[PDB]
């Protein structure tokens, strides 16, 4: 599924990300835009044998089990395929566990590169929330 901006915003809001652990909703809409362009089927293989999956491009080394990644931690305790849903619940639930890590949202390269330190509210303006 490719989500629209506000549509994604609405889903993230119902699923508890606005101000989760202090990050305003714009933070996550921003991360997804740059992680995957809002596409739930986004995949990206990496030199280390891992693969990023889904709308927030979650990595199979640490966060999910894909059956093929050396030394998988599977911290979200889920199959990476579950992150490929049109329904973003599993992605959201895992992203909250990642954001609850020491690094917070800086876990996402894209978010520290292009969302952190900017007017993240921009990403939800135009949306009635």
């Amino acid at each position: 599924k490719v989500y629209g901006r506000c549509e994604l915003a609405a889903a993230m809001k119902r699923l508890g990300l606005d101000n989760y652990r202090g990050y305003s909703l714009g933070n996550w809409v921003c991360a997804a835009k740059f992680e995957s362009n809002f596409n739930t089927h986004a995949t990206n293989r990496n030199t280390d044998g891992s693969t990023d999956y889904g709308i927030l491009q979650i990595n199979s080394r640490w966060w999910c089990n894909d059956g093929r990644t050396p030394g998988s931690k599977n911290l979200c305790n889920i199959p990476c395929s579950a992150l490929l849903s049109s329904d973003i619940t599993a992605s959201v639930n895992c992203a909250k566990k990642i954001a609850s890590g020491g690094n917070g949202m800086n876990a996402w390269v894209a978010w520290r590169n292009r969302c952190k330190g900017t007017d993240v509210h921009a990403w939800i303006r135009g949306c009635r929330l």
Partner: antibody
Amino acid sequence: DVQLQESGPSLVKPSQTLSLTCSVTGDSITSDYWSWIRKFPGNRLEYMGYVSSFGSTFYNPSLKSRISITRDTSKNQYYLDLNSVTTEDTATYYCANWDGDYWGQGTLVTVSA
Amino acid sequence: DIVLTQSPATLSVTPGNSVSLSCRASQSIGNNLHWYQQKSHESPRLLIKYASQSISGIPSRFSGSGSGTDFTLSINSVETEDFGMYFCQQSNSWPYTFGGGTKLEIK
């Protein structure tokens, strides 16, 4: 399956450190986030803190600075160290995983002189 | 810190009957409200994740609902083994905080 279990002394004296271990079964501790929770007599649960995958720690501000949560990955153990304890620190102590799926059975540790 | 407040403190119901427990947060916590039941000489068991998400192996008479600040745990026709303490806990805000519990006793 996953199974957690607390151990350590059951008597503690004021200004002494109460120390507990949590021994983990059925997974690597380095494969999850792990927490310490205590229950006082008033059916009052307090979240003490947790430790993430690489040892990053989150402590409750209510703990008077007296807390540390360390771990030994080789032993599939993690620990609670609580400095300068009082009778107020009398509680039933549990370890659990961060998602709350699995908890130790709990261990009563009393403080009082 | 977020403060959770549950009502009533003690709830009495006759077996087979239906119940609804409340957990409320001082300020909004999104859907980041989890529910725990705790019997005598047992540790907590996770019943419901994120307001309304079902947990593997929990009996379907456990349902959770709400959002924002207002939350409810429903048990459909409670059973004798359902009597015990119920707690809500938030995860939207650090430090994580628990309700003061509700006691599910017999009438």
